[PDB]
Amino acid sequence: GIVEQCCTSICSLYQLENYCN
Amino acid sequence: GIVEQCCTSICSLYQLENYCN
Amino acid sequence: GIVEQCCTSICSLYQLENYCN
Amino acid sequence: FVNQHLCGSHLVEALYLVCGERGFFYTPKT
Amino acid sequence: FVNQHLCGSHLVEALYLVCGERGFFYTPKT
Amino acid sequence: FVNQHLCGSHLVEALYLVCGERGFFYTPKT
Ligand SMILES: [Zn+2]
Numbered sequence: 001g002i003v004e005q006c007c008t009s010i011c012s013l014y015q016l017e018n019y020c021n
Numbered sequence: 022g023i024v025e026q027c028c029t030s031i032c033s034l035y036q037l038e039n040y041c042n
Numbered sequence: 043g044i045v046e047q048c049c050t051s052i053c054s055l056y057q058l059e060n061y062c063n
Numbered sequence: 064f065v066n067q068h069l070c071g072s073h074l075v076e077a078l079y080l081v082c083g084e085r086g087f088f089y090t091p092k093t
Numbered sequence: 094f095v096n097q098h099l100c101g102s103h104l105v106e107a108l109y110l111v112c113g114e115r116g117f118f119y120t121p122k123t
Numbered sequence: 124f125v126n127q128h129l130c131g132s133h134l135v136e137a138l139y140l141v142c143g144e145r146g147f148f149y150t151p152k153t
Contacts, residue, residue, distance in 0.1 A: 003091040006077075007070035013081055014064075019090070020082035024121040027107075028100035034111055035094075040120070041112035045151040048137075049130035055141055056124075061150070062142035072103060073132060102133060 002019060005011050023040060026032050044061060047053050069077050078087045099107050108117045129137050138147045 001090060001092050003074060003089070006067060006074050010066040010068050012064065012066050013077075016067075016078055016081045019078060019087050020085040021087060022120060022122050024104060024119070027097060027104050031096040031098050033094065033096050034107075037097075037108055037111045040108060040117050041115040042117060043150060043152050045134060045149070048127060048134050052126040052128050054124065054126050055137075058127075058138055058141045061138060061147050062145040063147060068131075071098075072106075076132075101128075102136075 002011065002015065006016075023032065023036065027037075044053065044057065048058075067077065075089055078089065081087075097107065105119055108119065111117075127137065135149055138149065141147075
C-alpha cells in the first residue's frame with residue numbers, strides 16, 4: 001500500500017492526498 | 022546497549038523506560 | 043556537495059555553517 | 064511538487080502537512 | 094504498545110515521549 | 124562538537140539549528 005510504496009520506491013503528494021479524510 | 026538494540030533489532034517502550042531518570 | 047557528503051560519509055557543524063546566509 | 068522517498072515517521076509528517084485540518088488515516092501493511 | 098525500530102534522532106524523540114518530565118539519559122556505545 | 128551522519132530531512136533540521144536567524148540555502152546535487 002501507500003506506506004510501503006513511499007518507502008520502497010517513491011510517491012507523490014497527490015498520491016498521499018488520497019489518505020486524507 | 023539500548024541505542025544499538027533499538028536500531029539493529031527492535032525494542033519496546035518498556036525497555037526504553039529504564040533510561041528515564 | 044554537502045548534502046551528499048553528510049549522508050554518504052560524515053560532516054561537521056563547521057562545514058554546515060558555510061551554507062548559512 | 065516533487066516525488067518523495069518517505070519511510071517511518073517521515074511519512075506521517077508528510078500526511079500531516081498534506082492533509083492539515085482534514086486529518087488522515089495511516090494504514091500500514093501487516 | 095508495539096515494538097519499535099528506532100535509529101538516530103528518532104530514538105531520542107521516543108525517549109522524550111516515554112520519559113516526559115522525568116527526563117532521561119542517552120548513552121550510545123562508542 | 125562531534126561529526127554527523129545526516130540524511131534527508133535531518134540535514135535540514137541541522138542547518139536550521141546551526142544557522143538560526145541567518146537562514147541558509149539547501150542545495151542538493153541533481
Ligand atoms: Zn529519519
